[PDB]
Every structure is written in C-alpha cells, then in structure tokens.
C-alpha cells in the first residue's frame, strides 16, 4: 500500500498509465493491463512497445536503488525532524544518535524493507501465475487461461524476469546463519 | 554534424615527459603481461549481493577505516597517545578523527566538525575552529591527526594538522627488466554525441587504435550513458542490453587487427549495469574464443599490473566530487590528488556525492589502494591534465565526447625500472 | 536436486544436530520462524485437548502439517526438489526457534516438550524400512541381524518372541540392541539375550529414540543460552526472538442492546428484573431461557 505504482506514458497519445495489477477489469471484460491504453480514444497497445516498458522498468529500478543508497536519515523526534545524509558513529542502544538534539534516534527515510517491498510489488504487477491463482476469480481465470493471451503471457514472463533478476542480487536483507549458530 | 566537421583532429592538447615523434607505435600487445595487482586483498571480480546495509555495519566500516589509517599514521609519526575528541583539553593534545560538515550543505571553514573513532572517542563529534591553523586542506571524510586544545569542552581548536603519508611505490621484480616500453591508450565515456547513438567517437578511437597499435587500451564508462537525452526520455527502440552488447562487439571486433589488450572499466552512469560502488565487472558479454585473452572486464576501481607497472584507474569523477567540498587556507587539483593518494582509498569522500551509490562493506574490501600507483587514470568533467603528484603521474584524459563536440583521449608510455621515471612520456590528444 | 541441492537432508526425521550454514533472507527467516511457532502451538493445543495416541490427534496434526507445509510423510520416490525445500524449512526453522526458546528455563521446557511430541508423531508415521534407515543414518545401530545369523539362532529366536510362527518368523527380521536399552523387555524375559545384545523384532523403541533426542536437545538449548550475547546485538532479529513466545499467530454483550428495542415487553420486564437482582424464580427462568433459545 505504500509502494509506487508503475507509471508508463503511452508513446502514441502520451497519457500516463498506472499499473498496479496484472489484470484490469472484471468478468469476461478482464484483460492484461498492458493490452489496451487507458485512453478510450487511444488504440495503441502498450504490449507493442514492450522494449520501452522494459527500459522504463530498468530506469525505475535504478531510481529506487539510488533512493535507498542515498542514505537519508530523519530524527524520530517530532520536535527535531533533523534530516541528514551523514551517519554519525555515536550510537545509542536503538541506533544512531541525532546530532541536532542529541536525544533521539535517526531512522532511515527509505529503509531496506521499503526497497525490497517496491521490488516485490514490481514483480507482483507482472506475476501472471500468481494473479491467476490468487487475484483472479473462477470465471475470470477460465477466460484468461485460454489462447488469445499466450503472447501477453510470454511478454509478462519476460518483464517479470527483469525484476526477478534484480531481486536475485539483493541481500534482503541477508541473515548469515553461520554467525548465529556456531 | 559539428563533430564530423572538426578541424583540430589529432592535436596534442597536453604533453609531459620525454619528447616523442609525431607518430606513436606500439608492440600490438606482443610482449605484454596484463593482470590485476596481486596484493593481500582479493579483487572484486564478481557480483556481490547488495541493497542490504545495516547502519551498524556502516558504523563499523567507517570506524575501522579511521582506526586503521590512524594506526599507520601513529606508527609513522611516533605519536604517543591519542585523546578522546569530545573531552575537554586545557593543554595541547593529539586527536585522531575524520572531517565533516555540521550541516547538509557544502563544507566551509565555519562548519567543520571532527568525528572520532569508536576506540578513542566513542564516535563523538566536536566542532572545529580553524582560526589558529595557518595552512590546511580539508574535505569531508578525511582522516586527520591534529594537535589542539579544547578549553571550553565544546570547540576544538587545532594548532597543527599532520600531513598525509602516501603508501610506498611498488618495487618491481626483475622478471620484466628486459621487456620493452608499453603503449597505453586510455579513453573515457561518453562515447557517443549527445544527440546520436551511433558511437562515432568510438569508431574514430578504434581507427586510432588500429593505426597506432597500442599495447593496452583502457576504456572507462559510461558505454550507455544514463544521462543521454535519448535514454532518459525513452526514445530507444532496442533494450539497453542490446545497445551495450553492440557497443562491446564493435570495440572488441574492431580492435582485432591491433591485437591490443582491452581493459573495460564500468561507470556508475552505465544504465544497463548494477548501480553500486565498488562496481563489479561487466558480465553480460562473452568474448569469442579468439579475444578471451585480450579482453579484461575489471572492476571500478582497478589496480592493474602491466609488466610491473602499477596503474590505478577509476571511472568515478573523483575530482569533481571532492572539489565541491574541499576547503583550503589558500593547484587545487594537485591538492585533491594528493589527498586521494594519502588517504589510500579510491573514494575517501564521506558522505559521498549525490550521484554515487556506495556499498560500504564492498567499499572497505575493494577501495583500499594497495600501493601508490605509477600512473593514476582519473577521468573528469574538469579539464584534461597530466600532473606529477608525489611521483605518481595522474592523467585526466577528459571524456571522448563533450556534449555535441568531440573530446580527447590520452596515450602514455610505461616501462618498469626506467631511469623514478616509470612514465616515459604522456600526451592528452584530441579525437 | 535442481540447482543447489545435496545429500544434506537424507531422511525426513532428524535429531537436529548440525546447525545450518546457509545465508538466508530476512523474509525467509521470519516466515520460517512464524510457521514453526504455529506448528508447535498446534501440537500443544492438540496435546491438551486430545490423547496423543487418539486418532483425532493424528488427523488434526496431519492437517496442520499439510497446511503449514512441513515434512510429515515419507516418499519412496527420491529426493524431489519440493521435498528438499520442505526439509530445509524444517531444519532452519527448528534452530531459529532454538534461538527464540533458550532464554528462560520455562521456555526451554516448553520447547522441548513440543519438539518431543512432534518427533513422536513423525516416528509413528514411519514404515519399518524407513525406520531402519533413520536408525542407521544417526548411528543408533539398533538391529539389523544378518539372515545367516538368524538361521544360526532360529530356534532361540522362535522361542524368544511370543506368538511367532515358523513361516511368519521366517518373514521377519530382528535388530541387535545393547541390553541396557531393552530393560522393559529383558526384565520380564520376553526377548532373547546373546552376548550382551537383545534380538528385538520389528512400540517401545520410539521411547528410547526420544530419550536420546531429549538428552541432545537439552544440551543444545543450554549451549544456545550460553551463546545469546552474540545475537542480541542484531536488532533485526531482536523483536522476533525476544517476543516470539508472545506472538499472535450472536454476542452476549449485544443482548442488553436488543432489550432496548426488539424484546417484547414480557422479555423486557424479565431482563430488567434479572439485571436488578441477578436471580429469577422458576417461571421466569423457563420463559427467558426459551426466549433466548428462540
Ligand atoms: S406475551 Fe409478550 S409478546 Fe406476547 S402479547 Fe404479551 S407482552 Fe406481547
Ligand atoms: Zn495511449
Ligand atoms: Zn534530533
């Protein structure tokens, strides 16, 4: 619920398309989101410009990784709300001590969990199989489990491969069980 | 249009060392041995899982950096005891710490703070008053030792700033005593004009390589710039990986006649690669069986050994990053380069610039400078140069393309044991 | 054995002797911890509610194990990737819970009890072949006699085991155990002893196995409590482990409200009297009870 949705500008009409699920619509009128543009007057299919969708996905992933590695910290105290990029070596039991007030902890503005959830959401909005099993209903599942959507399924699998590749390189995020159990 | 009709082709914009003929020729990488500098620490040669940094780990890495550099400097200077930075000091005391800015802006003489390490100061900070220091040069993240007094317990007043101590140069073995001088052509991205994706400057440079037959060609990223106007606005009809693959094929296949060892260094601006520093080597291209021994996909930063000559190189614009933060009492680039060499790290700036993503465990493991390099390639948006900083030849070849107009590259000659004149000659030349 | 598997998980049941050495994700850590906490709480609730030998206990425990996807049944097929995954789950989750359940003696006891119960159930679901496999993989060496030695002591074995027929005996294989483990059998002279070993045919054995298991587990928990300071410094895992034991995994009140509007005046009067005096004569009891049933 706190993750940004996938914004893609139609090459033809230039209208923003917000993607938050694999499938859009209800009943037999349900189709993959990237099949038709959000503008009724626009006949362009975003599935045609899947290279552009791939490029925008990579750019968005880069944007989120940059946001995470910016390392912005905010003081948890409402009356301080000090915002700094510098992590001080002075730590309390709860974490870095804010050097503006010297009495509250600095919390990451974009923690690792936020980035992990964003990447998981981008995977979710392209997970054909998961959407079919969980999100989609019975009649809708039947209508979507036929031909006329195999090409869309393949393109969605390719697009999910990108987010899967990125997540495969994420440590979140890593627990070294060797250090715990000795 | 503008690039293709340029008139200053081949102009030598900067020169250093022994004068050479108007034409340079190399051995085509015949009697050449290129490897990664074999130091105690293992090099970065494969991807490492990232995007998971614990604040405790960052604290530990920064603290151990300060502690290790301070230990080396204490042994070198025969300093007796370090004192906690935060505690008051009525008499003169020696304090080890790292410099920083009291606010988020750019450092100035009235915003300097010294943060101590965990061992001697529990990580405490103290404001610094530079009124009694006659000469200084400070940048954030700089590990320093200072003699000073803290009468109020609230403001440290330095009276002496200990100078930096660079690492010793490399003592080459005799195995390469009989090898000839080696020619190295180094160029840095971007390789295409701002309004094109055809890589015309790269084609010109490849023609130059085949013409001069250098022994090594060091190509630094970006190879598919993220700031390219076409890339940002999503006008490309092919995937990023495809464009990068085409570029690498062009480079490798086009250099076949020259037989030149190619050293490819990634850049943080490579839109197709992992955005993390230290950057792992490229791994999406498999050279043909006839080019495997010629292509070296190295990491950013890299310390290379070429017949015993140690070349340090980084794609990161270190000079631009540190020039925006360095404060001095009164050549600025020489000062920054000496700072880099004395801190013994390829990226001593903390916090980093806004354009670089730093994984601090990888930074700790793969940014220490093993020795002081004989040649240090530091491409920058700033002007090209060839400087001699503490016996190290620092070369900024500029960037091959500067917007719509063509840029510059560099060519230098290296021989182990020459005369310390390991760099016979060097030249920044126009494309 | 798809990509990164091995012989690390031969059998379903294990004594949990060797700690895991892998690098797992925080999400996987949390999922495994919570899932095994659910499994152990289900074990405890079923043990309180039902007799552990009861068929209801077995059915409900199998349902819970299937729901949480833990290894509970063998498979005479091979080490399928999915199976491997399940076993890995079990192995990691157990140790995670050890880290959670070693701080206080109370907690330790609770953990041990639940673990033992689970182990017993799983043993109860093991076919004789599988059982022997297990007893071998852990160097328990409870026999298995050769056929030649069996023929050598055929008559002794026949007279040792009660109600064993000649051919049926030929169809059975015995095990060799030190007599110190078969006390309950040797004491009433219902198993042959030869040279310090009892020859036990293919219910009590689980007991001995469990004893061994319990010993080991107690030792392990002690060691874990001794290695606690190294883990407390990892904030990520502190909220979980320090508090796992306290982790969450028509109404009577509205009746009064109904009495405001819906209740007919008779029931309103009865309810008012009941709340005024907390007691009703027999007629009121009958009327109000029947109405509340309605
Ligand atoms: S018995 Fe109750 S519901 Fe029936 S008429 Fe009397 S008050 Fe109304
Ligand atoms: Zn459109
Ligand atoms: Zn604060």
Swiss-Prot record, chain A:
Region (DNA-binding): 1-103
Binding site for Zn(2+) 1: 10, 13, 37, 42
Positions of CysA-type zinc fingers: 10-40
Record motif CysB motif, residues: 75-101
Residues bound to Zn(2+) 2: 75, 80, 98, 101
Highest taxon of the lineage: Eukaryota
Entry's localization field: Nucleus
Other observations noted: In eukaryotes there are five DNA polymerases: alpha, beta, gamma, delta, and epsilon which are responsible for different reactions of DNA synthesis.
Similarity section: Belongs to the DNA polymerase type-B family.
Purpose: Plays an essential role in the initiation of DNA replication. During the S phase of the cell cycle, the DNA polymerase alpha complex (composed of a catalytic subunit POLA1/p180, a regulatory subunit POLA2/p70 and two primase subunits PRIM1/p49 and PRIM2/p58) is recruited to DNA at the replicative forks via direct interactions with MCM10 and WDHD1. The primase subunit of the polymerase alpha complex initiates DNA synthesis by oligomerising short RNA primers on both leading and lagging strands.
Subunit relationships: The DNA polymerase alpha complex is composed of four subunits: the catalytic subunit POLA1, the regulatory subunit POLA2, and the small and the large primase subunits PRIM1 and PRIM2 respectively. Interacts with PARP1; this interaction functions as part of the control of replication fork progression. Interacts with MCM10 and WDHD1; these interactions recruit the polymerase alpha complex to the pre-replicative complex bound to DNA. Interacts with RPA1; this interaction stabilizes the replicative complex and reduces the misincorporation rate of DNA polymerase alpha by acting as a fidelity clamp.
UniProt-recorded name of the protein: DNA polymerase alpha catalytic subunit
Species this chain originates from: Xenopus laevis (African clawed frog)
Primary gene name: pola1
């Amino acid at each position: 619920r706190d993750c940004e949705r996938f914004k893609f500008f139609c090459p033809k009409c230039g209208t923003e398309n917000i993607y938050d699920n694999v499938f859009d619509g209800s009943g037999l009128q349900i189709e993959p989101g990237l099949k038709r543009c959000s503008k009724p007057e626009c006949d362009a299919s975003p599935l045609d410009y899947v290279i552009q969708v791939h490029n925008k996905l990579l750019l968005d992933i880069r944007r989120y990784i940059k946001k995470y590695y910016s390392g912005w910290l905010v003081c948890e105290e409402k009356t301080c709300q000090n915002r700094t990029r510098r992590l001080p070596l002075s730590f309390s039991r709860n974490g870095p001590i804010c050097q503006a007030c010297s009495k509250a902890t600095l919390r990451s503005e974009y923690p690792e969990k936020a980035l992990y959830t964003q990447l998981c959401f981008y995977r979710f909005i392209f997970d054909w199989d998961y959407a079919l099993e969980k999100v989609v209903s019975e009649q809708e599942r039947g209508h979507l489990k036929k031909k006329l959507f195999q090409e869309s399924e393949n393109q969605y699998k390719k697009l999910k491969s990108t987010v899967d590749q990125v997540l495969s390189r994420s440590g979140y995020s890593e627990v070294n069980l060797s250090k715990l159990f000795q | 249009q503008k690039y293709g009709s340029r008139t200053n082709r081949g102009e030598v914009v900067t020169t250093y060392g022994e004068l050479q003929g108007t034409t340079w020729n190399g051995g085509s990488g015949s009697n050449t041995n290129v490897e990664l500098f074999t130091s105690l620490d293992e090099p970065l040669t494969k991807m490492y899982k990232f995007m998971f940094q614990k604040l405790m780990d960052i604290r530990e890495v920064v603290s151990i950096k300060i502690e290790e550099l301070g230990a080396s400097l204490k042994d070198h200077f025969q300093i007796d005891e370090f004192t906690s930075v935060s505690l008051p000091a009525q008499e003169t005391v020696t304090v080890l710490g790292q410099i920083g800015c009291d606010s988020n802006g750019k450092l100035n003489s009235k915003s300097v703070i010294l943060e101590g390490d965990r061992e001697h100061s529990a990580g405490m900070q103290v404001p610094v008053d530079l009124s009694e220091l006659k000469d200084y040069s400070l940048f954030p993240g700089q590990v320093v030792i200072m003699e000073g007094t803290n009468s109020t317990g609230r403001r440290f007043v330095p009276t002496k700033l200990y100078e930096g101590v660079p690492l010793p140069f490399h003592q080459p073995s005799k195995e390469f005593e009989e090898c000839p001088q080696q020619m190295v052509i180094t160029a840095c991205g971007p390789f295409t004009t701002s309004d094109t994706i055809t890589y015309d400057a790269l084609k010109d440079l490849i023609d130059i390589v085949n013409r001069d037959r250098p022994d090594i060609c060091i190509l630094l990223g970006p190879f598919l710039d993220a700031k390219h106007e076409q890339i940002e606005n999503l006008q490309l009809t092919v995937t990023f990986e495809d464009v990068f693959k085409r570029c690498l094929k062009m480079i490798i296949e086009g250099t076949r006649p020259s037989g030149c060892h190619l050293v490819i260094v990634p850049s943080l601006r490579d839109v197709h690669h992992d955005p993390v520093y230290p950057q792992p080597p490229f791994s999406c291209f498999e050279p043909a069986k006839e080019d495997k021994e010629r292509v070296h996909f190295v990491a950013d930063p890299c310390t290379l050994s070429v017949n015993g000559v140690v070349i340090g190189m980084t794609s990161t614009d270190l000079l631009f990053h540190m020039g925006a933060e360095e404060i001095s009492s009164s050549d600025r680039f020489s000062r920054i380069l000496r700072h880099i060499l004395t801190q013994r790290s390829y990226y001593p700036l903390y916090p980093p610039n806004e354009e670089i993503n730093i994984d601090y465990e990888a930074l700790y493991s793969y940014t220490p400078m093993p020795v002081t390099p004989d040649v240090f390639i530091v491409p920058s948006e700033l002007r090209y140069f060839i400087k001699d900083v503490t016996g190290c030849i620092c070369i900024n070849p500029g960037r091959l393309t500067k917007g719509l107009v063509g840029g510059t590259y560099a060519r230098f000659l290296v021989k182990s044991g020459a005369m310390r004149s390991t760099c016979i000659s060097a030249q920044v030349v126009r494309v | 054995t798809g990509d990164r598997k091995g012989d690390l998980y031969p059998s379903s049941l294990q004594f949990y002797q060797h700690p895991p050495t892998e690098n797992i994700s925080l999400i996987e850590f949390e999922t495994f911890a919570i899932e095994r906490l659910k499994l152990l709480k289900a074990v405890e609730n079923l043990g309180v509610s039902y007799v552990k030998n009861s068929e209801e206990y077995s059915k409900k425990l199998e349902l819970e194990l299937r729901k949480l996807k833990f290894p509970y049944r063998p498979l005479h097929e091979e080490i399928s990737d999915d199976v491997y995954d399940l076993r890995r789950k079990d192995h990691i989750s157990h140790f995670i819970l050890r880290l959670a359940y070693c701080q206080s003696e109370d907690l330790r006891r609770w953990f041990i009890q639940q673990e033992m119960d689970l182990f017993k159930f799983r043993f109860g679901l093991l076919t004789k072949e599988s059982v022997q496999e297990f007893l071998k993989l852990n160097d328990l060496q409870y026999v298995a006699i050769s056929e030649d030695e069996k023929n050598m002591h055929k008559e002794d074995l026949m007279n040792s085991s009660f109600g064993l027929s000649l051919t049926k005996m030929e169809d059975t294989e015995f095990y060799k155990v030190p007599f110190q483990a078969a006390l309950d059998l040797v004491r009433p002279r219902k198993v042959f002893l030869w040279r310090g070993f009892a020859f036990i045919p293919h219910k009590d054995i689980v007991s001995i196995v469990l004893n061994d298991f319990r010993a080991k587990l107690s030792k392990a928990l002690a060691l874990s409590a001794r290695s606690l300071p190294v883990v407390q410094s990892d904030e990520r895992l502190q909220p979980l482990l320090n508090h796992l034991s306290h982790s969450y995994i028509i109404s009577l009140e509205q009746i009064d409200g109904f009495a405001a509007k819906s209740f007919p005046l008779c029931m309103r009067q009865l309810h008012k009297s009941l709340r005024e005096n907390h007691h009703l004569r027999h007629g009121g009891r009958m009327q109000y009870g029947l109405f509340l049933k309605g």
